[PDB]
Amino acid sequence: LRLKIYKDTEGYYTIGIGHLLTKSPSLNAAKSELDKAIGRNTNGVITKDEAEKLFNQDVDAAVRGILRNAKLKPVYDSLDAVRRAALINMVFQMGETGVAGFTNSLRMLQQKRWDEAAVNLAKSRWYNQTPNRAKRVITTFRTGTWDAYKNMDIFEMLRIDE
Ligand SMILES: [Cl-]
Ligand SMILES: [Cl-]
């Protein structure tokens, strides 16, 4: 959808399907990151094919972040496939270290206390800053369904949220 550099909900330079380029306030710094990611002089604009390539890599990266993380892996391993997509969604948005910080929520999720996990996940900066997205992800954790995305797989889910 967005094939030119934009800022994300935190004001950070981004392109494509939520591909964060840099936290630097320099648009030139962001353009340099873009060119390095794409492998050419893009001047701040990419193709659809390029956007989808970065997206595939970014999803892979989020899965790899979980599997390499001592706190996230055992939660991920305990979840069914639909709830695993909710966890990948969080990591995609906030990064592995950020999600690994939800210690209490992760525990509740591992215990399969879905309603209590949902309540705990909402007492977060995440929820207060991106409540509609957070509500969709949380409903996914609570129900183990894709109901919140009705009007599926992790790629489609992120295409919707991002
Ligand atoms: Cl992202
Ligand atoms: Cl709580």
CA distance 117 to 65: 21
Question: Token pair for residue 103?
Answer: 């210690």
Q: Which residues pair with 13 in a beta bridge?
A: 7
Give the phi and the psi of residue 129 in degrees, each rounded to 5.
Answer: -95, -35
Domain count, the chain: 1
Active site residue 8: yes
Residues with CB under 5 A from ligand 2 (ion): 119-120
User: How far, in Å, is the centroid of ligand 1 from the Cα of 158?
Assistant: 9
Clarify whether 156 is annotated catalytic. Answer: no
The answer to whether 79 is a known ligand-binding residue is no
H helix runs in 79-153, sequence order = 81-94, 96-100, 103-110, 114-121, 125-129, 131-143
Give the phi and the psi of residue 45 in degrees, each rounded to 5. -130, 130
Ligand nearest to the CA of 88: 1
Range of the domain at 69: 1-162
- 120 is annotated as contributing to ligand binding: yes
The DSSP secondary-structure symbol of 93 reads H
Experimental technique behind these coordinates: X-ray
CA distance 143 to 119: 13
Distance 123 CA to ligand 1 centre (A): 22
Q: State the distance from the centre of ligand 1 to the C-alpha of 81, rounded, in angstroms.
A: 20
CATH code: domain of residue 89: 1.10.530.40
- Is 106 annotated as belonging to a binding site? no
d(CA 35, CA 74): 36
| Pairing assessment for the beta strands 13-15 and 6-7 based on DSSP bridges | antiparallel
- 119 C-alpha vs ligand 2 centroid, how far in Å? 5
CA distance 143 to 124: 20
